[PDB]
Amino acid sequence: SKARVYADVNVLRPKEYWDYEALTVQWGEQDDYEVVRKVGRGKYSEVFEGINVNNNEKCIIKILKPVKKKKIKREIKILQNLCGGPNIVKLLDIVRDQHSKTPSLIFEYVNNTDFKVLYPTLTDYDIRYYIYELLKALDYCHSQGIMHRDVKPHNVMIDHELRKLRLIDWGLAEFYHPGKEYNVRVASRYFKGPELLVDLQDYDYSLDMWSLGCMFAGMIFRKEPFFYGHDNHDQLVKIAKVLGTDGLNVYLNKYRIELDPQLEALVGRHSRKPWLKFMNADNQHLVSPEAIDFLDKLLRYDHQERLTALEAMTHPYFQQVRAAENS
Ligand SMILES: O=c1c2c(O)cccc2oc2c([N+](=O)[O-])ccc(O)c12
Numbered sequence: 649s650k651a652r653v654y655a656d657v658n659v660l661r662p663k664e665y666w667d668y669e670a671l672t673v674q675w676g677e678q679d680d681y682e683v684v685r686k687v688g689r690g691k692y693s694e695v696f697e698g699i700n701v702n703n704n705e706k707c708i709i710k711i712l713k714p715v716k717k718k719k720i721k722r723e724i725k726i727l728q729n730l731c732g733g734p735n736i737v738k739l740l741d742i743v744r745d746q747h748s749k750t751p752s753l754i755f756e757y758v759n760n761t762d763f764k765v766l767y768p769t770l771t772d773y774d775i776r777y778y779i780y781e782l783l784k785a786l787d788y789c790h791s792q793g794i795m796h797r798d799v800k801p802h803n804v805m806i807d808h809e810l811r812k813l814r815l816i817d818w819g820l821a822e823f824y825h826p827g828k829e830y831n832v833r834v835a836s837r838y839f840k841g842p843e844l845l846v847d848l849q850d851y852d853y854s855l856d857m858w859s860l861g862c863m864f865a866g867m868i869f870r871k872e873p874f875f876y877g878h879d880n881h882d883q884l885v886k887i888a889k890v891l892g893t894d895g896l897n898v899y900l901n902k903y904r905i906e907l908d909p910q911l912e913a914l915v916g917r918h919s920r921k922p923w924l925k926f927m928n929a930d931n932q933h934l935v936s937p938e939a940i941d942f943l944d945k946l947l948r949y950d951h952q953e954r955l956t957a958l959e960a961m962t963h964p965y966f967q968q969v970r971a972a973e974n975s
Pocket residue numbers: 687688689690691693695708710737755756757758760805816817818819
């Protein structure tokens with residue numbers, strides 16, 4: 649399997665663009681940034697809000713708790729290559745953290761409003777708008793030969809007041825190379841694509857489109873997460889209970905994949921459950937034929953059948969967003 653788009657991006661670029669291991673950081677000075685308070689944590693990162701001592705503006709300080717250095721260079725190299733892209737967080741500086749020998753990434757400040765409180769208030773139009781903004785970020789990073797691999801509400805910061813969106817945490821992001829087999833223990837459980845769950849390792853940018861689909865489904869149906877599995881095996885079961893096993897079967901057959909016996913039994917057999925079956929009084933104001941058509945084209949077992957970020961952006965669902973933009 650290989651990406652249907654942007655497959656040769658890293659093939660055409662200098663080895664220095666994607667060879668993150670050869671990266672040598674220009675360590676800045678730690679006293680240049682002052683921590684003001686904690687704001688959260690990734691899987692292996694402590695995040696704080698700070699202030700640049702020199703120019704007094706606000707910044708974000710992400711201390712990469714022991715991640716592994718190979719992994720630290722990867723994230724830095726990717727952030728450097730993506731800086732300036734639409735709706736992508738911007739890396740301003742890189743320093744050493746006193747309490748530890750942990751690198752510490754300084755980002756431009758991003759005001760975010762917790763999605764758990766924000767999402768319930770978004771109107772039909774707001775959802776179209778923000779998803780389109782997120783799509784701009786994905787088509788951009790894909791066009792630059794990079795897969796984010798951890799798309800989820802938690803990594804999409806939105807300033808609802810200024811209507812600004814930023815795709816964050818590129819700690820699991822990677823460079824796409826045709827035919828390469830990647831690790832499947834990426835992304836967060838609820839947003840893991842079928843490829844990660846059946847061990848199809850030569851996956852590509854399309855993985856992000858599945859995760860986007862999961863986020864989108866949770867938003868329009870007001871059910872988060874939309875696929876609520878309790879472990880990776882159960883996650884595939886939850887997906888199969890909605891998309892049906894008929895399609896799962898065609899997929900496994902196409903890619904010559906054999907589900908282990910345990911997982912195959914857990915999956916069982918299920919008929920497809922119509923998207924409209926998920927509509928109720930709480931989400932009626934968000935479920936429209938265009939929303940469902942767009943969603944349907946994202947949540948496909950076959951990663952090769954999913955919309956690309958560029959195609960997604962031209963879907964009629966976003967027609968008003970584009971119209972408004974062309975002015
Ligand atoms: O990983 C990040 C992150 C995280 O894991 C958990 C909670 C907040 C975060 O914020 C970030 C911000 N930010 O808030 O501007 C910028 C870049 C990042 O990588 C992160």
